[PDB]
Amino acid sequence: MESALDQLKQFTTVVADTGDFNAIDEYKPQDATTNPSLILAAAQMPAYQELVEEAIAYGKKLGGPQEEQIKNAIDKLFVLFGAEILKKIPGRVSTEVDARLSFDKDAMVARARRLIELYKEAGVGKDRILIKLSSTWEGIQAGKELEEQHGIHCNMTLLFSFAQAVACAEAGVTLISPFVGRILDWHVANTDKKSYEPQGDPGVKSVTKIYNYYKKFGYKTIVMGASFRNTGEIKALAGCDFLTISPKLLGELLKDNSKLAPALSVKAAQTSDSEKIHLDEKAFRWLHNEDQMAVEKLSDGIRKFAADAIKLERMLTERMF
Amino acid sequence: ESALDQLKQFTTVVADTGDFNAIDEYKPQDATTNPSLILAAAQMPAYQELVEEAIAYGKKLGGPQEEQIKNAIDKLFVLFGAEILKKIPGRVSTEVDARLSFDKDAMVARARRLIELYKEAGVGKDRILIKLSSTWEGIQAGKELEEQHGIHCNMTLLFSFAQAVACAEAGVTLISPFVGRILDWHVANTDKKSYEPQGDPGVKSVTKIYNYYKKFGYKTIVMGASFRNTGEIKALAGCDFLTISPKLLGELLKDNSKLAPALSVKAAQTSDSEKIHLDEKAFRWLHNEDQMAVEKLSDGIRKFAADAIKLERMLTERMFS
Ligand SMILES: O=S([O-])[O-]
Numbered sequence: 001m002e003s004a005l006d007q008l009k010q011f012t013t014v015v016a017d018t019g020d021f022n023a024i025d026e027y028k029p030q031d032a033t034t035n036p037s038l039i040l041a042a043a044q045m046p047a048y049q050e051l052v053e054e055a056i057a058y059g060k061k062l063g064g065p066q067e068e069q070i071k072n073a074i075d076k077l078f079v080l081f082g083a084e085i086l087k088k089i090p091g092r093v094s095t096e097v098d099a100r101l102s103f104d105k106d107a108m109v110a111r112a113r114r115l116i117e118l119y120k121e122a123g124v125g126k127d128r129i130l131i132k133l134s135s136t137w138e139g140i141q142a143g144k145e146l147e148e149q150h151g152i153h154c155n156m157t158l159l160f161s162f163a164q165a166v167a168c169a170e171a172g173v174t175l176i177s178p179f180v181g182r183i184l185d186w187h188v189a190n191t192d193k194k195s196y197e198p199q200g201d202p203g204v205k206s207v208t209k210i211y212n213y214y215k216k217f218g219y220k221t222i223v224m225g226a227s228f229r230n231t232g233e234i235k236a237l238a239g240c241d242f243l244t245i246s247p248k249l250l251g252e253l254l255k256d257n258s259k260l261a262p263a264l265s266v267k268a269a270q271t272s273d274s275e276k277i278h279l280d281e282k283a284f285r286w287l288h289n290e291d292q293m294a295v296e297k298l299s300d301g302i303r304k305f306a307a308d309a310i311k312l313e314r315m316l317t318e319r320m321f
Numbered sequence: 322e323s324a325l326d327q328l329k330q331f332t333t334v335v336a337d338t339g340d341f342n343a344i345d346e347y348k349p350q351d352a353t354t355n356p357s358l359i360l361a362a363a364q365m366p367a368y369q370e371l372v373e374e375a376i377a378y379g380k381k382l383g384g385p386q387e388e389q390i391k392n393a394i395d396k397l398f399v400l401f402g403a404e405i406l407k408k409i410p411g412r413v414s415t416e417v418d419a420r421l422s423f424d425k426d427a428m429v430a431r432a433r434r435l436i437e438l439y440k441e442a443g444v445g446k447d448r449i450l451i452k453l454s455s456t457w458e459g460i461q462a463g464k465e466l467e468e469q470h471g472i473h474c475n476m477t478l479l480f481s482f483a484q485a486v487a488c489a490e491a492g493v494t495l496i497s498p499f500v501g502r503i504l505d506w507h508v509a510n511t512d513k514k515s516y517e518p519q520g521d522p523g524v525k526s527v528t529k530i531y532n533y534y535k536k537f538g539y540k541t542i543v544m545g546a547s548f549r550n551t552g553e554i555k556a557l558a559g560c561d562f563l564t565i566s567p568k569l570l571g572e573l574l575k576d577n578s579k580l581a582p583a584l585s586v587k588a589a590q591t592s593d594s595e596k597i598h599l600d601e602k603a604f605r606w607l608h609n610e611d612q613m614a615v616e617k618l619s620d621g622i623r624k625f626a627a628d629a630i631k632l633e634r635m636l637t638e639r640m641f642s
Pocket residue numbers: 181182227228
């Protein structure tokens with residue numbers, strides 16, 4: 001008698017969505033993911049103050065104006081959590097670039113390369129890292145550049161529209177994190193339907209559509225559903241390549257013993273009604289704009305993560321100067 | 322003396338409509354049309370002669386249906402524009418298909434085609450303002466049209482300060498910052514459902530833009546557009562131009578309350594702000610910081626595209642079996 005979590009692993013690679021690395025091992029995941037918000041929350045926990053202190057000391061030691069010291073400390077902090085996480089898992093860890101760079105391709109490429117150098121400085125090879133980038137047109141092209149010119153593997157996040165998914169596939173990025181929960185959020189707030197059956201959940205439908213397109217046309221980019229509101233959405237996506245889940249929902253799955261069966265499959269994808277398209281910049285911007293939810297959620301997701309960066313740098317600034 | 326006549330002493334009045342048979346009633350200087358107003362006008366019995374002419378025009382040019390329908394809709398836009406000019410002493414704004422909002426080159430070309438059609442109808446480009454969505458691409462399209470072809474543009478769907486700055490640096494002839502749709506967003510997204518004139522978020526937006534423009538000496542004409550009540554309009558007295566619907570113009574004519582200008586070049590000199598420059602990436606970032614603007618620009622584009630599609634359908638149904 002296996003838990004829903006153990007069954008899910010038979011059809012999908014499980015990933016833990018958190019910076020709270022002490023809570024990861026209980027769920028024995030393959031990979032783990034962090035983001036500006038998760039790092040901010042973890043950096044505020046007593047259990048991880050030594051990391052914050054080490055980040056602060058690193059920035060101070062290198063010296064320079066506040067801007068320089070803060071950049072060194074916050075990037076070092078992101079890397080320290082990443083390194084501790086890698087010690088708890090056999091796979092990769094995702095680390096996100098400051099969201100304030102989302103519309104600056106060259107800055108994201110540089111920041112991504114910088115994070116990789118810091119990991120190396122910490123004794124971690126790039127093969128165990130996934131750099132997360134906002135899926136704006138600039139972010140996707142940054143990903144294509146990182147992959148093709150530097151062998152730096154990326155995780156394209158805040159992916160809501162089909163246009164973003166297509167752009168990422170064409171970019172040849174290592175992995176994508178199409179959101180589920182925030183899509184449900186939008187529909188509940190912007191439509192008369194406040195509740196859905198698992199397979200009818202708009203976020204579930206989005207990942208399903210993206211998964212089928214990718215598998216049908218043979219794109220190698222890994223599909224990892226992300227952001228969940230309930231276990232129903234997660235179960236409805238079993239069969240998906242990867243799924244990153246919060247410790248809370250992972251706990252629910254570990255306690256649940258009902259039977260699970262995959263809803264997604266490569267074979268079912270090959271017979272789907274997907275139609276291959278190609279998007280240059282202007283085609284992408286138009287198609288993305290046709291998806292109101294995606295426009296608003298990508299935009300808000302960027303503002304929120306930037307706010308988490310600002311808040312984290314403030315917390316550091318008040319302890320460094 | 323009516324509020325309308327008082328307003329004219331501080332601001333140049335513009336009529337927002339395609340219903341030219343009565344567009345000289347409030348003696349406006351300029352006139353503005355958009356995909357929605359043309360669609361509405363084209364369905365009016367009084368203007369069927371123009372529609373039939375547009376239809377006959379597209380057919381004579383030949384080519385596939387898609388080409389005849391395009392030449393017909395463009396001919397129609399120009400036909401209305403030409404009729405409006407016979408009734409007013411100023412300019413008339415004609416908008417480019419919103420479906421081209423992210424295609425700089427296509428907007429430039431379509432604008433040149435419209436100017437060519439006007440020339441055929443015996444209208445010089447001096448009587449014309451080509452309306453373009455204020456996306457980065459639309460703004461650069463306006464810049465190219467002004468500098469390379471001497472074609473004057475009216476940048477519309479302008480919601481954020483970032484768009485305003487971008488238009489100013491592009492040196493476009495005129496901008497149409499919105500007021501009413503900004504109120505709409507705040508009413509729907511905040512707890513405050515009513516605002517006194519100077520507190521109206523749409524009024525504040527145009528005020529910020531006007532003061533910035535006049536303070537730093539930009540020549541771009543500021544024309545407040547989109548109004549929900551006369552309170553917003555009066556609160557912007559002093560603005561270079563104001564385009565108002567025939568309905569609200571009637572209300573101003575019937576209103577006999579005393580009006581005082583709220584905006585002036587002199588006062589703008591002491592307004593609080595620093596001059597900034599925006600390259601593409603800086604623009605995209607600053608624009609994204611304005612949630613209301615991101616959402617309204619995006620939706621405004623979808624809405625006008627929907628109007629173009631509905632107008633094309635109406636024509637195809639009358640041009641082909
Ligand atoms: O990413 S949170 O919205 O699930």
